[PDB]
Amino acid sequence: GPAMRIISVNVNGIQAAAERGLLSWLQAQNADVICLQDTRASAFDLDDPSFQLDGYFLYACDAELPEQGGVALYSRLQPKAVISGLGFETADRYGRYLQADFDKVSIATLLLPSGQSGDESLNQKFKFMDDFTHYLSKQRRKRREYIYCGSLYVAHQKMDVKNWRECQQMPGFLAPERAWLDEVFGNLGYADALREVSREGDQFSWWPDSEQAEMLNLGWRFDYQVLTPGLRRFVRNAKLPRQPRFSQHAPLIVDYDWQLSI
Amino acid sequence: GPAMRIISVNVNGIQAAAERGLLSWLQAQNADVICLQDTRASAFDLDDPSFQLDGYFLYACDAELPEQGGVALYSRLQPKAVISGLGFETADRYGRYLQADFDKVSIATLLLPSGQSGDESLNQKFKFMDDFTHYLSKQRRKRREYIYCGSLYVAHQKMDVKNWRECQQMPGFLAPERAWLDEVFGNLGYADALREVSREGDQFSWWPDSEQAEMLNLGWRFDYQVLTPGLRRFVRNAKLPRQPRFSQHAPLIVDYDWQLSI
Amino acid sequence: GPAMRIISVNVNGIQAAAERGLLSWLQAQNADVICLQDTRASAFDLDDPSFQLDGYFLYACDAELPEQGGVALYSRLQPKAVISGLGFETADRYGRYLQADFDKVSIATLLLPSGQSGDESLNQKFKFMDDFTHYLSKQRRKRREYIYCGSLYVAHQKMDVKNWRECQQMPGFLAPERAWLDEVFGNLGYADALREVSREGDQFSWWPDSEQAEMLNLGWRFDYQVLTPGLRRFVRNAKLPRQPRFSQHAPLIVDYDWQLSI
Amino acid sequence: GPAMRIISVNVNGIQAAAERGLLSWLQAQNADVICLQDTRASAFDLDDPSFQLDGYFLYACDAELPEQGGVALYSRLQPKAVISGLGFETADRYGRYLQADFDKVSIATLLLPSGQSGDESLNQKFKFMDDFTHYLSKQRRKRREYIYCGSLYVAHQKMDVKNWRECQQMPGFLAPERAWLDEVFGNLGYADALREVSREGDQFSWWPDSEQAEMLNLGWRFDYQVLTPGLRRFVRNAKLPRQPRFSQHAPLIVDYDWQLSI
Amino acid sequence: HSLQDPYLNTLRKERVPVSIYLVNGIKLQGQIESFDQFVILLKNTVSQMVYKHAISTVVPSRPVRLP
Amino acid sequence: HSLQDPYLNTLRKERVPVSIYLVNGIKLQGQIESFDQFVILLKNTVSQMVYKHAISTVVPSRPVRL
Amino acid sequence: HSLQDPYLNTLRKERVPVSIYLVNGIKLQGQIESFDQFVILLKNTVSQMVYKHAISTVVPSRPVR
Amino acid sequence: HSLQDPYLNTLRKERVPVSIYLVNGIKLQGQIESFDQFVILLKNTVSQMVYKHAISTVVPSRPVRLP
Amino acid sequence: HSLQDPYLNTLRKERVPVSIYLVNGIKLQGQIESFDQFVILLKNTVSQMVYKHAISTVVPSRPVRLP
Amino acid sequence: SLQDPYLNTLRKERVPVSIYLVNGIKLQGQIESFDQFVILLKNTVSQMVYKHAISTVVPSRPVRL
Amino acid sequence: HSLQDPYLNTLRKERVPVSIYLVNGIKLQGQIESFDQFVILLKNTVSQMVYKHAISTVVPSRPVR
Amino acid sequence: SLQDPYLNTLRKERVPVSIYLVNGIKLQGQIESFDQFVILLKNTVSQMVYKHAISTVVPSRPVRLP
Amino acid sequence: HSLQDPYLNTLRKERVPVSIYLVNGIKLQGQIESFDQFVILLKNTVSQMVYKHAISTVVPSRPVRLP
Amino acid sequence: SLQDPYLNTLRKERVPVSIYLVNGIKLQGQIESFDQFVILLKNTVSQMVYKHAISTVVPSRPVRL
Amino acid sequence: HSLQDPYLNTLRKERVPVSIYLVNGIKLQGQIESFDQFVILLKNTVSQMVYKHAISTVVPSRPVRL
Amino acid sequence: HSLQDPYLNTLRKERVPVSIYLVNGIKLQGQIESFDQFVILLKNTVSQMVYKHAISTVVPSRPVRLP
RNA sequence: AAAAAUAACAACAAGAGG
RNA sequence: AAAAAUAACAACAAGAGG
C-alpha cells in the first residue's frame, strides 16, 4: 500500500551531470524526494528552467564560493519547512546541509569535505565530523524523525571497500573515520539504510576516474542514508545501481514503507 | 491491513481473578498476545483446563514460594523461543520475567516488587530497578525488538497520578523512582506505548481498594508497555479500559501496525 | 592546567586571630577564595583597613547579636552574585551562610552551632541540620555546581576521630548526627574534598585549649568541604598544616583543577 | 580507599646504586611495583640473595652485553603473567622491556637508548621510537590498561627544559624527538602521570655529574609514566625526592587509586 | 516605532534571510514579506503570519545595517 | 491593524483549513469562523475560542492572497 | 467589547461544562459563574478566579451556538 | 475590574487562606492583605508583592459567595 | 498605582536585602537602587536592570511595614 | 525614567552588556540603538531583541549612572 | 563419554531445565528430550537437534545429583 | 542414534527446515539428501552444507521419530 | 563421504562458478579445479587450496543436479 | 598421557581453577570429575563443559605435578 | 591427503612466497619449509609452526601447476 | 608427529621464550614445560595447560633450527 | 518548524538560543 | 534464540557467558 522512494545521487557539479543526462533519468524513476549533493552552483543558477523537473519543488543551498560546495533537494510535495545550515562554521558557510520538513519525518541532504585533497582538507573533514557528531548528539531529544542522505566520503567496514589491506592509509578508510562511523551507527543508534535490508558484499558507490578501476570494480561506498532508530523497520529495498552513472558516484535508491505527507 | 493487539492486565492472583470473569473477557477481545503479571500460582496449577483459553498457548514462569510472583503469557502463534528469567537474583528466583521470541520482535512480560509493603520491599525494588536498567543497557545493542509489558508500580510523570502534591512520599511516585523512569524513557531511547497515542490526563491504571478513591478517580498509572525505539511509530491505539476491571489494576490494550509472525 | 585555591579557616574570632598573624599569612598565599568562619564581628567592624586585605574584595555576613558568629569571604575576583542566608530563621539571624556565585560554580562558606553548651544549642543544631538537609534536597535539582566550606562540628563515622569508644554520647559525635552525614553522603550524593586525596584519619581540625591536646593530639576533624558530585574529580591538593594556625580550628588549604572566571 | 604504590627508578647499574643504599631504602617502602631501569647486570647477578627483598618477587630481563641496558621488576603480588620484549630487533636483545600482567591492568618497565654517545645510537633511538609507535598503534585495539614506567630521554614541550634557546639541536630535545611525543600525546592521545598531579615544571629527573648541575639545578626530566586512556584519573601522589638519589637520574614514587588484584 | 521599522523594512527590501527566534526558543527561517504594527509574515515555503508578542529576536543571516 | 484583518478574512471567507500554533507550542487546527480585536473562533468538532495573546503563528494549508 | 462576551454569556446561561486551557497548557474543567474584562469565575467545588490573560483556549464540551 | 475587586475584597475581609497559582505553575499560599490595580499582597511569615501579570488563578480554600 | 510604589520605596529606604522572583523561577537577591513603572535596578556586586513584566514576586527577608 | 538614561549610559560608554531573556537565554554584545519596543545588540551580526522578551540586562564592568 | 551419559540421562529423567551455551555465545534454554553420541535434542516450544561439537557448556537451572 | 531418523523424517515428510550454523547464519530450505558428513538442501540451488558447521536444525512443523 | 564426491565431480565437470562460504562467513567465489577428501582447489586468478574442515557451505550459481 | 595425571593432581586437593574457553570466557570453580570428552566444574552448580570448547585451564595456587 | 601433499611439496620445491589465511581470518605470510600430517612450518624472520586445524586457505603469490 | 614432536622438543630443551597463538588471537608468552599428543604445559608466573585444538601457531622469540 | 494541550515543582543568578 | 553469509585485523594473558 504505502511506499516512499528516496534517491540521494551525488552529481559532482550539476551542469556536467545534466549534460550527461541526469534529469531525464530522474524524471523516469518516480522518486518522492531527490537529494542532490555537490551541486557546484549558486541558487541563482538553479531556478533556470533547465534544472526544473516538473511535479517537483527544487530547494537549493549554495556555498559562498559557488564551486566549493552546493546542495539541492527536489520534493514531490511542498514541505512544511525547508531550512539550511547546521550552525557550525564548516557546514553553514560552504553549503553542506539542507533539511526538508514534512509531517512526522524530515529529510536532510548532507555533503562533506572529501578529505582526499590534502592535509588541510583532512583537518577540515575531521572538525566537520566532530561538530556533526556534536549536532547529532542533540538530535535524540526531539521527535521529528530524520533521514540524512549524505555523501559522507567515509567507508564504514571492510565490506564497503575493495582490497582493504591497501586502503588503510587513504582518506576514506582511516581509523578515526571508521571510528566515527561505528560511533554514529553503533552507539548513537542510527541505522544505515543500505545495510538494514541488503547484507551483501560488492555493493559500491564511488569509483576513481581510472578506467582500470571501473572495469574490475575497484570501488568504495561513500554515500549513505543514515536513519533515526524509529525508521529502521520501514526499509523495504535499498540498492546502488551499478551501470547508469552520471558522476564519479552512483545513485542510492531506497524504498521505504513510510507514507510521506505534508 | 496488518494489525496486532497486546493486553497486559495485572490480575493479583489468577485464581481470584478468574472467578470474577477474566478468561471469558479475554476470550472475546481478539488479542494476539496476552501478558499476565502477578499470577500467584505455580506452573503446575496453570496446567488444568480451567485456565486454558482455546487458540492460545499458555507459557508460565512461577515463583519459588508461589504467592510472591508468577507470570504468564498467552500467545496466538507458537513463539520461536519462550525463555524465563533476566539473569540476576531478584528476578529469576521470584518469577518476574518471561519472554516470547517471534520473527523480528519479542514480547516480554515483567513484574516488579510493589515497594508499598515496607522498607525491605522498597530496598528490593530499588535493587531490581538498578539491575533491570543494567539489563536494558546490555540489551540496547541487540537487533531484536522488545515489548516489555510491565507492571512497573512506578508513576513517571505528574499527569500519571491524581493530586501529586501528597503523593511525593508514597512509593510509586518517589524521586529516585521518577528519575528511573526518566532514565529508561528519556536517555535510553525507550518509548511508552500509552504516551505515543494519547497525550491526555485522567488515564489511570491502579486504584487502592478504598472505594472513596474508586468512585472519584483517585488513581495511579503503574503498568506500561515499554518499547524499543524501532516500534515507536507502529503504535496505533493504546487505551486503558476504566470499567471492566478484574483486579486492583486496569488492563492495557495496545494496538500496533506490526504484523506478528512465527 | 587550572589551579584554584580555596582556604577555609574557622578563626574563632577575627580579632582574636589577627593578633597571631592571620592577615600577614593570608596575604602571602595568593589565594583565590578565603572562607572565614565564626568571625564574632559586625559588618562595620570589617570596614576598617586593619582587617582589610588589599586587592581582595571582601563580603561578610554578621549575626544580629555579633558575639555569636558570622562568616566572611575574600576574593579578588568580583563575583556575578553573592547571597546571604539559607532561607529560614536560625541561619539568617546568625550569619551562618554566605554563597558567592561565579559562572558554572558557587563557593559557599557555612557555619554551624557547636551544640556543646547545653541541650538547647543541640536541639537548635538539630533543627538547623534538618532544614539544611531539606535545603540540600531542594538544591539537588539545580544544574550549577556548589562548594560548601563548612564547619559542621560533626564527624561522619567510626574511624574519623581519636578514642571514639567514649565519644558515643558526647555532642559532636552522636548517633543522629552521624545518621545525618551518612544519608547526606548516601542518598543525597555529595562528597568531600579531603577524602578524595586523603582516604585516612590521623589528620584533624579541632583541638581543645589544653597541653595534652597540644602534645598527645586529642584532635577532632570538623572543617570540611562538601561538594556536589560534579566536582569530586578536580580535587588535587588538601592541606591541614598543624602549627601554622591562629585559632582552635586547623586552616584548610585546597587546590582544585578549576578555572574560576567572572 | 585504594592505594597502589609504583616506583620507577633509573639506577645506572644496580650495584652502583646499591652501594649508595638502594636496597635498604627500597625495603622500607612497602611498594607494590618496583621498576628498576638500566640495571646493567645479568640475571645470574640478581640471583644474589642480597637483592632478594622482604617477600618481593624478582623478574628481570637482561641484554646480550648486559651493561648496555636491562630492566628489573619487583612485586609482592605474583602476576597473571610477565612478558619480555616487544617483538622487534632493538628491544629484545637489549633488555629494554618487561611487562607484568595483573588482572585488568598491566605495568611495563621500559628503557630507551640515550643517543648521546654517537650518531649510531641516535639512529638506533629513532628506529626504536618509530617501531615503538607502531607497537602502540597495534595495542590501541586491545581492552586492558597499560602502565609504561619509562625513561624516554625526550622532553615534550617548551615548559620541560632549562636553558631553552640552545637545546634545539642537542639529542634529547630535538625537533622529530619532540614531534614523536606530540603525535603520541596528540593524535594517538596517551597521558602522562607526572602532569596529572603537577601541571607545572621546575622538577627534573636527570642531572649530569658535575658540581654546577647539582648546585645550580641544570636538570633534565626523563623518568615518565605513560598511561593509556582509562587510567587518567586514579593518580594521586607523584613524588621525585631530590637529595635521596642513587644515580644521575632521580627516583620516582607514585600512588594510584587502583585495587591491584591477581 | 521610530527605530523598529527602518530595520524590518530593510530586511524586506533586500530579501535578507532572517531567523525569528520565538519566546519558545523555536527558530523560524524565512524572509520578511510584510509587517504591520503587530504581525510579521515570513515565507519559507508557505507564507505565514507571526505575532510580535511571540517573537523574541529577529536576526539576519548575512550582516545588513540600517539606513 | 494595517495587515491583521484581510489575512484572517481571506482565511475565513475562502474556508481554508488553517493551523494555529500557540505560544506553548500546541498545534490547533480547524477553520476560522470569526474574529475580533482579541479572539479567533475556531471550527472543529466543537467551536473553541482562542485568545490572540496565546497565538504564536497562523499557518494556512493552501496559500492565500490579500 | 465584541465576540467573546456573546460567546461566554451563552456558556453561562445554557450551563455548559467548559474546559479552560491556560497559557502553560493546563486544563480546568468546570462551569462559568460570571465574568467581566480579564476575569472568568470557574465553577467547581471551589470557585476560582482565572485571569483571562493567562488563558489560551476556552473549549466547550457540547456544541453550542 | 468591575468583578475583580469585589471578589478580592471579599477574600480579604473574611481572611480566607488562598492558593494563588502563577503563570509558570507555582503555587503560593497565605492570605490576601492588599490589592491594587497591579499588585496583590500575599501574607505568610513574610509579606510579598505578587504581580497580576504573572497570576493564573486565585483559589480559596473554603467556598465563599459574592455580595 | 496606589500601592506598588510605596512598597518599593519602603524597601528602598531601609535597604533590606530582597529577592526578586522572575516568571521562570529565577531568584535574584540584592538591594533596590531605584525604579520606574517599567524597570527596577538591583544592587548586587554588579548593578543590573530588571523589567517589571518579567517579575513574578518581590519578597523581603526582614518583615517590613507599610506607611 | 531611568530605563533610557541607563541604556544611554550603556551605549555611550560602550559596555559589553549581557541580555538575559525571559526563558533563560544569555546574549552578550554591545548596544547599537534602542526604541520604546526594541533593543539592538551588535556582534558578529547585529540583531534586534524585542523588549517584552528581556528579563534582565547586566553590564560587564561596574558602571555608574 | 562414561561421565557425559549419566549426567545427560539424569537431566533427561528429572526434566531439569538446562541452558545449553553454544560455541558462538548463544544461550539456548530448554529440556533435554533425548540424545545420542553426537546430537542432543532440546524442547522449549519446538523440538530441535543440537550438535555436540557446537556445544560449550550445559548448565542446569537448579542443582542435581 | 537419532541423527538418521530425525533427518529422514525431515526429508520424507518434506518439512521446511531452518538450519543455524556455528557462526549464527540460518539457512532455510528442505532437506533433499543427507550423508554421514553433508546435508544437501534445496531452496533455489542444491546446497551442500557440512555437518561440522551445523549448530542446530529446527523444523517449521514438528516431527515424530519413527 | 558417499554423497559429496559425485556432487563435487559434477561441479567440476560442468565447470560451474561455485561460491564457498567458510566457517567464519567469507565467500570465496571461483571454480573447482580438483578435490581430495581433505581439500578443495579453486581458482579465479590463482589456484587456492581451501581446507575442507574450514568450509561451511558450497553454493553453486546456476542450479545443477546430482546424476 | 599428560592430561589425566594433571587433571587428577589438580582435582584432588580442590584448587579453585579458571577454565578459559575458546571465546575468551573464563569459568572459576573446582573440578569434580572428568573423562575423555568432558570436564565438570563447580562454582554454584555442577555444570558440564566440553573440552573442545576449552582453550586453557589455569590453576590459582601454583601446584606441582 | 593424496592431493594436498603434492601441492604443499611443489610450493616449497619452487619456494613460492605463500599467504596462509587462518580460520579466524589472520593473514600470515612467508615460505613453506616442511609439512607433516598436522603442521606446516612457515619460514620467515623466524620459522613458526602453524597447525592444520586452524588454517582456512593457502594461497600462492605466483600461479603454479601440479 | 614427524615435525611437531621434534619442534616442541627443541623448544623444550633450550628455554626459548615461546609464544603460543590461540585460534581467537590470544597471544600467550611463556616456556614449554612438557607436552603430549593433545596438550601443552606453559611456564610463566603460573603454569598453564593449553590444548592443541585451540592452538593456531607456536612461534619462538629466538630463531631455532631442527636436526 | 513547534506534543488537540502535565487541576498546576513556596520557585534552576539565568542552556549564543527547550 | 542465532545477520541466506565482512576474498579474509603478523594476530585483544582471554567480556560466569557475544
Numbering used by the authors:
A (entry chain B), B (entry chain A), C (entry chain R), D (entry chain S): -2 to 259
E (entry chain H), H (entry chain D), I (entry chain E), M (entry chain M), P (entry chain I): 5 to 71
F (entry chain G), O (entry chain N): 5 to 70
G (entry chain C), K (entry chain K): 5 to 69
J (entry chain F), N (entry chain J): 6 to 70
L (entry chain L): 6 to 71
Q: What do the study authors state?
A:
As a member of the extensive Lsm/Sm protein family, Hfq shares an ancient structural core that oligomerizes to form toroidal architectures exposing several RNA-binding surfaces. The Crc protein is a member of the EEP family (Exonuclease/Endonuclease/Phosphatase), but the absence of key catalytic residues in the active site cleft indicate that Crc has lost enzymatic function. Crc and Hfq act together to translationally repress mRNA target genes. To gain insight into how P. aeruginosa Hfq cooperates with Crc in translational repression of amiE, we determined the structure of the complex they form on the Hfq binding motif of the CCR-controlled amiE mRNA using cryo-electron microscopy (cryoEM).
Interestingly, recruitment of a fourth Crc monomer to the complex restores the C2 symmetry, preserving the symmetry axis from the core complex, but with a conformationally different Crc dimer interface between Crc molecules 3 and 4. In the 2:4:2 complex, a second type of Crc dimer seems to assemble with a smaller buried surface. Notably, the additional Crc dimer is in a more ‘open’ conformation than the dimer in the core. The same key Crc dimer interface is occupied but seems to serve as a dynamic hinge, whereas the secondary, smaller, dimer interface between the Crc helices is absent to allow the new Crc dimer to adopt an ‘open’ conformation. Arg230 is reorganised by Glu193 in the same protomer to self-interact with the corresponding Arg230 in the partner Crc, rather than with Glu142. Additional hydrogen bonds are formed between Arg233 and Glu193, whereas Arg229 is no longer part of the dimer interface. Interestingly, Crc3 and Crc4 do not interact with Crc1 or Crc2, and seem to be recruited solely via Hfq/amiE6ARN. By reorganising the extra Crc molecules 3 and 4 that bind the 2:2:2 core, the alternative Crc dimer is able to utilise one of two basic patches on its surface when engaging amiE6ARN without causing steric hindrance to the already bound Crc dimer. Direct interactions between the reorganised Crc dimer and Hfq are limited to the same Crc β-strand and exposed loop of a sole Hfq monomer, as in the core complex. Thus, the structural model can rationalize the observed increased stability of the Hfq/Crc/amiE6ARN assembly when compared to the sole Hfq/amiE6ARN complex. It is conceivable that full repression is only achieved when amiE6ARN is masked entirely in the 2:4:2 complex, which is supported by our in vivo studies.
